[PDB]
From a paper:
The system includes an inner membrane platform of GspC-E-F-L-M, a periplasmic pseudopilus composed of GspG-H-I-J-K and the outer membrane secretion channel GspD, called the secretin. In numerous species the targeting, assembly and stability of the T2SS secretin in the outer membrane require the function of a small lipoprotein that binds to its C-terminal region (the S-domain) and serves to pilot secretin monomers from the inner to the outer membrane via the LOL lipoprotein sorting pathway.
The structure was solved by molecular replacement with Arcimboldo Schredder with the structure of AspS from V. cholerae (49% identity) being employed as a model. [name] is a compact molecule composed of a central, 5-stranded β-sheet and 4 flanking α-helices, and is reminiscent to that of AspS from V. cholerae (RMSD 0.715 Å). The floor of the cavity, formed by the central β-sheet, is decorated with hydrophobic resides (Ile48, Tyr73, Tyr89, Ile91), and a disulfide bond generated between Cys74 and Cys111 stabilizes the cavity wall formed by α-2 and α-4. [name] employs the central part of its β-sheet to interact with α-12 of EpsD*. The EpsD*:[name] complex fits in such a way that it allows the hydrophobic residues Ile639, Ala641, and Phe642 from EpsD*’s α-12 to be placed within [name]’s pocket. However, we also observed that residues located in β-1 of [name] as well as the loops that connect the individual strands in the central β-sheet can clash with amino acids lining EpsD*’s α-12 if the pilotin is to remain in this conformation in the complex.
Residue numbers in the entry:
A (entry chain A), B (entry chain A), C (entry chain A), D (entry chain A): 5 to 114
């Protein structure tokens, strides 16, 4: 429906607002800098501190992104209802190194 | 021409690359975090440290943006050739507070 | 008295504790990183962001230190009772550039 | 000798200077903020990012301090000659959580 799409867009906007108020927040070498929405997508922008780690663990950042969002009760409900999360991770130079959609399908077996 | 547009797009991409290598760089309460390009536009993303200043001097940020880009010899040449700069400034929460194009016209009397 | 010295030492320790809980806090190009006590002295350690300003305004940092502590109602009372503040400011390299006692006498005419 | 003590004090001062020029530098959740000397001691002050980790791994910070300084060719030579390193680690609040001497004896079996 148009009404279900409208509801998801309003949910994505509200949830981006809620999460924005607490920024920036660090989780080890990740610093969450910016949260936005677009349609039914919550966009999470983080700096991965390449300067501090001397590493670029792309595989690990992706696998831990999928598992952490999927295992969060609130995000998992949101995904199943039709919200999607877009995870953008930049290195210390601000260069984009990960740009990955997490959807309800991401959490399912395949 | 198609060739002049192609040249400006290649210039915007190269110049975004050059400036990215030095990031992040601070200019008082501004921290330049990310530089990108799109077509003939160099996009400059900065955090204005609202937490540290307790202020939101929107007028000042805009007037000093126009004057600083216009008065830079290299940027002024680039603007006159057809490159444009897009200045995006976020507060401490990552919320967008300025999104302003600077073009060759920005430097002229009116 | 021994008892008045003991009271001032306990006050300096408690006040260092109170202020520590809120750190780090920025005031423009100053970042308060560490607060300690020693006897009747509250020690305030800040980084002055020499990298961001490209300046070392020693005179200004000293005059604004004396005036800001002297004009604060709580600090002014504390100073008059016999507490002292030691202001240590380091540059971006962590090198000590100011180490200045502020006492009750600092606020008086001379 | 007085001359060997003087040589170690001059070495500690010079080495503190050398290391200061590169600050701040991050090694994962450690940020080296300040390096000083006192007599034959190089003092290393770091922030351990308790806010980002949600942990206080005191044992690990101490064991990895001893092993990293002992296993560094230059530091190991310096220690054997009579220089000592004092490792001070503060949490996110600037509160001192580790203050540990590393000496030539630290690297030996016992
Ligand atoms: O890693 S996801 O499938 O839970
Ligand atoms: O402020 S611009 O017109 O130089
Ligand atoms: O500057 S002090 O004397 O208030
Ligand atoms: O851990 S130290 O003994 O090399």
């Amino acid at each position: 429906n148009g009404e279900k799409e409208r509801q998801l867009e309003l949910m994505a906007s509200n949830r981006a607002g809620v999460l924005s108020a607490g920024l920036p927040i660090e989780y080890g070498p990740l610093k969450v800098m910016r949260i936005s929405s677009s349609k039914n997508i919550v966009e999470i922008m983080m700096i991965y501190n390449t300067d501090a780690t001397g590493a670029k663990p792309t595989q690990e950042l992706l696998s831990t992104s999928v598992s952490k969002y999927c295992e969060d009760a609130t995000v998992r409900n949101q995904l199943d209802m039709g919200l999607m999360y877009r995870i953008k991770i930049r290195n210390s130079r601000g260069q984009l190194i990960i740009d990955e959609m997490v959807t309800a399908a991401s959490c399912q077996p395949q």
